[PDB]
Amino acid sequence: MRILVTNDDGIQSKGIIVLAELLSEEHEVFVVAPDKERSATGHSITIHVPLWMKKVFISERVVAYSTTGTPADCVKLAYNVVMDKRVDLIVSGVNRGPNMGMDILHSGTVSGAMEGAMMNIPSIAISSANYESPDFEGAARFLIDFLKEFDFSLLDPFTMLNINVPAGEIKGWRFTRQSRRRWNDYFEERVSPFGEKYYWMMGEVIEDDDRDDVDYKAVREGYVSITPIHPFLTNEQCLKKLREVY
Amino acid sequence: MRILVTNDDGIQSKGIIVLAELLSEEHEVFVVAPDKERSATGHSITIHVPLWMKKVFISERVVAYSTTGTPADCVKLAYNVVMDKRVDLIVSGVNRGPNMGMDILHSGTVSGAMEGAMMNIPSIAISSANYESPDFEGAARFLIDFLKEFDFSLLDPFTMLNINVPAGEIKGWRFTRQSRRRWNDYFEERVSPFGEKYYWMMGEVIEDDDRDDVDYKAVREGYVSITPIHPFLTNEQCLKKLREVY
């Protein structure tokens, strides 16, 4: 009912606008997003300098604000300064491009929802798995239908859903685990006009997951990937063996 | 033998200098760190703009470079541009202040080591758990001794160690799990000279872990907390129940 919508691409992104519009048809939507494009922002927050907000217009039905902070800052601000600590659901995204595998850690889109999970508020990060030709309306429409069948009592404490939607035809959806999808990075070296070398990061993807129920596999098969994630990074198995040996 | 040292507080931090100096006595050390103070940077990387490096002096025994990027950028640059893809160990830190519980996700110090884990290179993030009165030499000396007794074959793939060292007397060390230590945030509102309100983030810590083997409990008891962590955020239990129901 009381939904907070945020993103990583900025308040002007079509991805966050269409999402907010559709959700506003049946819910009280507040939009608090960065006042500018963010990329590979990860889960950073702003505590060393002040934060600022400015009223923005998106719809007469939705309350929108842009801020000078990151997606996580936006969630904190929305919760404390705008919504009077009353939020039933946080949806971050309709991001242009996928957020799968280990890239989840560099994702500002996921960090926005994760901020909500850390506060223990049901949250969802949703991305259109096709940077080139995103399908913002289709991903948003999928979410609307998905919410009608999802039982939030089944989403554990401090847990959020990471959703990746195929840009084309959606065959259906699957609950998936995070993959180990990652990148083989390297840099292209170039020279400035003043003779200084600078580096451009590039890379080739690595997809070598043995398991079949991982995020990128559902997505390439035409299914929406839905992964339950939480802010706990302990490697239990390793910890167990370490204690067993020491 | 071939060690890469980085941090989040910048190449001028005493914390990274003392660490590098001590490690250089018996190993070939390379230091690649941010050219400036970072805070709550999380695991962000730079792919939208070029990266730059500048040779810096710390010791005639260590090769040091500052970069315009984040801790993770530094690791990528060090690996590809400086060390010819030959690194035996990555140590990020001797950070001023703790990196425990959920704060691990906002930590630039942890992100530096995590970048190494994602590359599957043994990595360690180490912090002095006392921002006010850090003990950089003591934390670094602890690590030197710890390395003499730690078997890296026991550190699973894509797994790193998050170390928090008490600033005072070290009673010993414990393998711990990440806690749910977190913060009850709120903002103090102020007004600019031109009449605009701005917000300062503040907060009271929440420590309500039932388990006794968590990071902050070992640290307050006087023990070094050592947590094995990896870039996998799937909540397995939740995923299992979700599949069981759907």
Curated annotation (Swiss-Prot), chains A, B:
Top-level taxon in the UniProt lineage: Bacteria
Effect seen on changing D9N: Loss of activity
Signal peptide (from-to): none
Catalytic activity: a ribonucleoside 5'-phosphate + H2O = a ribonucleoside + phosphate
Gene Ontology terms, MF aspect: 3'-nucleotidase activity; 5'-nucleotidase activity; exopolyphosphatase activity; metal ion binding; nucleotide binding
Coiled-coil ranges per UniProt: none
Subcellular compartments: Cytoplasm
Temperature dependency: Optimum temperature is 80 degrees Celsius. Active up to 95 degrees Celsius.
Entry-linked Pfam families: SurE
UniProt cofactor note: Binds 1 Mg(2+) ion per subunit. In contrast to other surE homologs, is essentially inactive with other divalent cations.
Gene Ontology cellular-component annotations: cytoplasm
Its EC number(s): 3.1.3.5
Sites where the protein binds Mg(2+): D8, D9, S39, N95
Cofactor: Mg(2+)
Activity at various pH: Optimum pH is 5.5-6.2.
The entry's keywords: Cytoplasm, Hydrolase, Magnesium, Metal-binding, Nucleotide-binding
Regulation: Inhibited by vanadate and tungstate.
Family annotation (SUPFAM superfamilies): SurE-like
PANTHER family in UniProt: 5'-NUCLEOTIDASE SURE (PTHR30457), 5'_3'-NUCLEOTIDASE SURE (PTHR30457:SF12)
Quaternary structure and interacting proteins, as annotated: Homodimer and possibly homotetramer.
Family: Belongs to the SurE nucleotidase family.
Function: Nucleotidase that preferentially dephosphorylates 5'-GMP and 5'-AMP.
Protein name (database record): 5'-nucleotidase SurE
Species this protein is from: Thermotoga maritima (strain ATCC 43589 / DSM 3109 / JCM 10099 / NBRC 100826 / MSB8)
